[PDB]
Each structure stands twice: as structure tokens, then as C-alpha cells.
């Protein structure tokens, strides 16, 4: 029998999610998981994901399961895949050229996007340079266009590195918020544990 099902409800169902820039980083360790029901549920708009195949994913287990969740506009859900570049893709969260986990996404139009506008989700749109894979960016300091450091006088040209989504209930299907998670699988030299039903 299974000793403990890998906890997924707190992050899939959940009650709240952080913004994409301050994106959460959940770790999962010795356990037994039921990704199969994840395939079974039809509520996932885009379950399609890379690396290991879903049907045999339950037979080659790992040491670390790194689950990272966030929400974005629907249209740039394509911006989560190896090799591609884009505003959310490049300035917030990018993936290595190789990848041993994969992604899931679905719709939350009725949950999120309050009628008057949630306005409680921020994303980076400026930065000095490109972004390393799997690095958190909590830096809440001013960014400059150039030739002028405004020295914390935030305002003119100081370009606050956080612009709001500005959701509305009737913007359109291309802008309605989508909930995205990614499960990266890491095989360290330590013994592998995260494999379940057998």
C-alpha cells in the first residue's frame, strides 16, 4: 500500500498564487505520487509537456520534484518551453535547453479577474540583462533606461520594475488569467524516491 500520496491539492486546487516575478518554489521529496489522475482530469487546458512521456512517467523516478506555480495571461502560455524567448519567458522564468520535468496549465477566469480588476499580480518588463535559469528575482530595486541613475527618486525614468496585468472580466479569452505549474524532475547521485503506484 502507499504510505502517503504526494500532496498536490494544496498547489493545484490551492487558494492563492503569487505573482510571476516572486514565483513560489515548492520542494517534494521521498513520497509516492499519482500523476495518472493528473492526466485523467480534463480540466487542464494544456497538459502537453516535454521531456519524459506522461504514460511512462510513472516508471522512471527521481530524487527531487520541484513544483513551481504561477498565473499569467493565457496567450503567452506558449512562453514556457525550452529555447523560446519572450517577455515573461525571458525576464521572469526561463527553462534550460534540456528538461526532465514538464508543465501543466488551465483556465481560472471565474476564480480570478475580479469584475473591477484584481490588480494583484505583477510581472517584470524591464531588466539590465537576460535571465539565468531557475533563479528567483525578488530584487525590488529601481531600473534605469540609461545615462541617468535616478538614485531612488522613483518616478520619472525610474521605471518601476513591476507593471500590473490589469485584468477585466470581459477583456477576452486571449487575456483571461491562466494558472500554470511546472514540475521539474531532478535525478541526483542520491537514491531516487519519488515513484508510486507500482
Amino acid at each position: 500500500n502507499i504510505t502517503n500520496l504526494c500532496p498536490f491539492g494544496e498547489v493545484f486546487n490551492a487558494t492563492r498564487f503569487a505573482s510571476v516575478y516572486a514565483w513560489n518554489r515548492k520542494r517534494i521529496s521521498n513520497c509516492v505520487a499519482d500523476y495518472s489522475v493528473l492526466y485523467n482530469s480534463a480540466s487542464f487546458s494544456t497538459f502537453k509537456c516535454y521531456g519524459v512521456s506522461p504514460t511512462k512517467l510513472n516508471d522512471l523516478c527521481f530524487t527531487n520534484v520541484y513544483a513551481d506555480s504561477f498565473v499569467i495571461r493565457g496567450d503567452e502560455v506558449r512562453q514556457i518551453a525550452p529555447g523560446q524567448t519572450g517577455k515573461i519567458a525571458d525576464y521572469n522564468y526561463k527553462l534550460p535547453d534540456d528538461f526532465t520535468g514538464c508543465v501543466i496549465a488551465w483556465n481560472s477566469n471565474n476564480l480570478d479577474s475580479k469584475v473591477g480588476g484584481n490588480y494583484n499580480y505583477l510581472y517584470r518588463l524591464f531588466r539590465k540583462s537576460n535571465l539565468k535559469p531557475f533563479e528567483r528575482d525578488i530584487s525590488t530595486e529601481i531600473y534605469q533606461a540609461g545615462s541617468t541613475p535616478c538614485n531612488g527618486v522613483e518616478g520619472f525614468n525610474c521605471y518601476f520594475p513591476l507593471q500590473s496585468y490589469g485584468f477585466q472580466p470581459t477583456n477576452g479569452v486571449g487575456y483571461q488569467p491562466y494558472r500554470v505549474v511546472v514540475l521539474s524532475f531532478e535525478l541526483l547521485h542520491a537514491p531516487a524516491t519519488v515513484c508510486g503506484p507500482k
Partner: antibody
Framework: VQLVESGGGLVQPGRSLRVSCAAS????????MHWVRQTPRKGLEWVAG????????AYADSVKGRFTISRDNAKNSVFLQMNGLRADDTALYYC?????????????????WGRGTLVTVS | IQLTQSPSSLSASVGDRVTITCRAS??????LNWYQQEPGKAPKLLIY???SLQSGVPSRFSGSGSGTDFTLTISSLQPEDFATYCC?????????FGQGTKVEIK
């Protein structure tokens, strides 16, 4: 992306005047607004440009302090109060939007211009 | 800050190799801008940072320069390019233009 202006025309020197410029077709919360002047049959010249969140502002040296600005965030527009009129101010006036992208992405970049209003002081 | 252009004006024909230079009094870097205005309507953005060509614009345009000297270059001149082209300074907040260069037919 369209712009509309009002408040110009023929006025006598020594009075006070007001100019409004509104726009639509984008998200007005960004794209620091600007004003430019052009005297007829001669080189145009920039006037003003302020900020995103009504932050620190700047003006041309020739007319600094004499005129003032206001960012109408609500009805996505901008007010420009003209004080101490001079006959030199007679020109075509443009209210101009700004971009957000590029290499350096400078707010002083100008694009999506409107139409302009004739202003005469005599 | 004083900005100059050369030539002040010119008259050309279709498909010509056009070239206009712009000089700044002090080193501004590259943030200089290139604008056009055709007779009758609203001017639009053409070149920003002296190295970026605007979207939805023919690739025949070209821009270059640095320091204080910059230059627009036209491989094949076209009938729609006979307009007034001007420089723009993107340096310390007081900003001015150049004298411009109207493009005339020859």
C-alpha cells in the same frame, strides 16, 4: 491610436489660456506624455514632457515656470495651462505620446503624434 | 546644447544613394533619434537610438553613428521620401533638434 486636441486659437496678449489633449487606442497608465511646438515655416521645438505616474516634470528653459501641466489619468488626457501670452508663442502645437520599448527604451522618444492646434497671440 | 545637420537641404531623384549627417556639440552617445514629416500630416518615428529601424517601415532606410556624428543612409530613394527629416537629442532633459533637411526632387 487616435488623438484629439482643443483649447487653441486666436487670443490677445496678456490673457490666460488652457489646452486639452485626449487620446485613445492604448493603455494610458504608461507612455509619459509630451508637448512640442512648431512655428510656421521654421524649425519646430520641443515644449514639455512629464512622467508616467504624474512624477517629476521638466520644461523648456525659455518658458520654464510660466506654463503648467496636468496628467488627466481618469479621462486619458492632458491639460496645459498657458500663462503670460507672447506673440512668439504663435505656432502649431502638438501633443505626442511615447513608446516603452527599444534598445535604451527612452521616454523622450516620440511617436503616435496627434494633429496640433494653431495658437496666435496678437 | 547645439545640434547641426548636413546638408541643410538637397534635391534628389528616384533610387539615389542619399546620405545625411548630424553632429552634436557634446558626446551624447547613441540615443539620438531620426524623425520625418511629410507635407500635410502627422510625423512618425523612424529611427531611435540611431541604430534601430522602426517596425512597418521599408528596410531601405539605414542609420548609423556614435559619439557626436551620426548618419542616415538611403539605398533606393522613393517618391514618398521627399519630406522633412530631423534629428532628436535624447540627452539631459533640456532637448532640442537640428535644422533638418528637406528632401526635394531633382
Amino acid at each position: 491610436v487616435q488623438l484629439v486636441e482643443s483649447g487653441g486659437g486666436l487670443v490677445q496678449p496678456g490673457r490666460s489660456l488652457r489646452v486639452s489633449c485626449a487620446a485613445s487606442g492604448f493603455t494610458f497608465d504608461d507612455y509619459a506624455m509630451h508637448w512640442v511646438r512648431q512655428t510656421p515655416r521654421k524649425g519646430l521645438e520641443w515644449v514639455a514632457g512629464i512622467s508616467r505616474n504624474s512624477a517629476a516634470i521638466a520644461y523648456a528653459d525659455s518658458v520654464k515656470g510660466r506654463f503648467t501641466i496636468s496628467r488627466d489619468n481618469a479621462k486619458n488626457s492632458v491639460f496645459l495651462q498657458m500663462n503670460g501670452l507672447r506673440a512668439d508663442d504663435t505656432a502649431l502645437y502638438y501633443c505626442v505620446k511615447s513608446p516603452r520599448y527599444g534598445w535604451g527604451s527612452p521616454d523622450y522618444s516620440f511617436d503616435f503624434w496627434g494633429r496640433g492646434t494653431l495658437v496666435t497671440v496678437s | 546644447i547645439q545640434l547641426t545637420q548636413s546638408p541643410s537641404s538637397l534635391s534628389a531623384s528616384v533610387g539615389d544613394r542619399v546620405t545625411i549627417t548630424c553632429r552634436a556639440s557634446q558626446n551624447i552617445g547613441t540615443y539620438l533619434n531620426w524623425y520625418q514629416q511629410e507635407p500635410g500630416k502627422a510625423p512618425k518615428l523612424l529611427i531611435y537610438a540611431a541604430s534601430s529601424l522602426q517596425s512597418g517601415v521599408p528596410s531601405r532606410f539605414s542609420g548609423s553613428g556614435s559619439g557626436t556624428d551620426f548618419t542616415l543612409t538611403i539605398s533606393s530613394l522613393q517618391p514618398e521620401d521627399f519630406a522633412t527629416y530631423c534629428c532628436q537629442q535624447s540627452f539631459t532633459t533640456p532637448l532640442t533638434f537640428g535644422q533638418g533637411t528637406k528632401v526635394e526632387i531633382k
